[PDB]
Design a binder for this molecule. Structure first.
Ligand SMILES: *[C@@H]1O[C@H](CO)[C@@H](O[C@@H]2O[C@H](CO)[C@@H](O)[C@H](O)[C@H]2NC(C)=O)[C@H](O)[C@H]1NC(C)=O
Ligand SMILES: *[C@@H]1O[C@H](CO)[C@@H](O[C@@H]2O[C@H](CO)[C@@H](O)[C@H](O)[C@H]2NC(C)=O)[C@H](O)[C@H]1NC(C)=O
Ligand SMILES: *[C@@H]1O[C@H](CO)[C@@H](O)[C@H](O)[C@H]1NC(C)=O
Ligand SMILES: *[C@@H]1O[C@H](CO)[C@@H](O)[C@H](O)[C@H]1NC(C)=O
Ligand SMILES: *[C@@H]1O[C@H](CO)[C@@H](O)[C@H](O)[C@H]1NC(C)=O
Lengths: 49, 87, 106, 7
């Protein structure tokens, strides 16, 4: 059976806050296709040879 | 028939654990569980940030917190009736 | 939209039949727990932070920006007033310092 | 400032 992720209970209470004391710059890749292979078909040459 | 219907990869019980995790993060930690590790904050102060983000000064929340909570609880209640009444 | 974390910038690079984005982002790290309050009572009046949040290390109260720990002494120009102490749920009692106070030694 | 510097 697949696992969705680590279980966690956030330490919430009516007077507690967590503030970060440091940081990391993170560089992330994202990839998108933009164009197909341009094609032309001569249907008389394909059909009738 | 020759025709077949296939199960989804995620079952409804797995979808319900994701909607639970999103909701439990949102209630306990604001947007921070999207931007990094979840950081806890009290829900009245999370709503003070949500108010300050729409240009309403945050003292307006604390000075009206009971009214705002009652309007929210009432508005949630109407969703049950609105879904129960018609398909 | 432009990569996980808070977005700083991105750079395009070409690829065959497509494009690649290098998204540069700020991710917060090394958090600590603090006690917090929505407002502070000074002379019978409620002070709220102009930006950031009130926090305590257990003995002192500070105001800090909310995305990086940088504690400041709480003052009349870090904060703004609205109304009497009695309305706000969870208000706490602390001094708010006035920068003009020692200048009154003139 | 003006009422405070009246002191
Ligand atoms: C909360 O922060 C304040 C300021 O950093 C701490 O107060 C200082 O404590 C040291 C001894 O540890 C004294 O020498 C300084 O004179 C104090 N400064 C002031 C402005 O009072 C305080 O100790 C911290 N408390 C905790 C529990 O960490
Ligand atoms: C914050 O400080 C005020 C006084 O500056 C406290 O108010 C007094 O509280 C006692 C009971 O603890 C009452 O008998 C007095 O009548 C109150 N005085 C005034 C002027 O209202 C207040 O309780 C403190 N708040 C907290 C959370 O400790
Ligand atoms: C912040 O993180 C970097 C590593 O990302 C570390 O070298 C640096 O010492 C840290 N600073 C503090 C104050 O924790
Ligand atoms: C914050 O405090 C709680 C206990 O009050 C603890 O379980 C939790 O691990 C702490 N979190 C951090 C980031 O120190
Ligand atoms: C916060 O919760 C504690 C019990 O956990 C309660 O004694 C206190 O009055 C509450 N304070 C606020 C501001 O809700």
């Amino acid at each position: 059976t697949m696992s969705l992720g680590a279980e966690n209970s956030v330490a919430y209470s009516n007077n507690s806050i967590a503030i970060p004391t440091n940081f990391t710059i993170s560089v992330t890749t994202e990839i998108l296709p933009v164009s197909m292979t341009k094609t032309s078909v001569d249907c008389t040459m394909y059909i009738c040879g | 028939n020759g025709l077949t219907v296939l199960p989804p990869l995620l079952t409804d019980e797995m979808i319900a654990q994701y909607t639970s995790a999103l909701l439990a993060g949102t209630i306990t930690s604001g947007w921070t569980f999207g931007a990094g590790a979840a950081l806890q904050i009290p829900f009245a102060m999370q709503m003070a940030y949500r108010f300050n983000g729409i240009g309403v000064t945050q003292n307006v929340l604390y000075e009206n917190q009971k009214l705002i909570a009652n309007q929210f609880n009432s508005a949630i209640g109407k969703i049950q009736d609105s879904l129960s009444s018609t398909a | 939209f432009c990569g996980k974390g808070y977005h700083l910038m991105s750079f395009p690079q070409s690829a065959p039949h497509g494009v690649v984005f290098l998204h540069v982002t700020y991710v917060p790290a090394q958090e600590k727990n603090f006690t917090t309050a929505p407002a502070i009572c000074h002379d019978g009046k409620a002070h709220f932070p102009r930006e950031g949040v009130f926090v305590s290390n257990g003995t002192h109260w500070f105001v800090t920006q909310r995305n990086f720990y940088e504690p400041q002494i709480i003052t009349t120009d870090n904060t703004f007033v609205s109304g009497n102490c009695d309305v706000v749920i969870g208000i706490v009692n602390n001094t708010v310092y006035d920068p003009l106070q020692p200048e009154l030694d003139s």
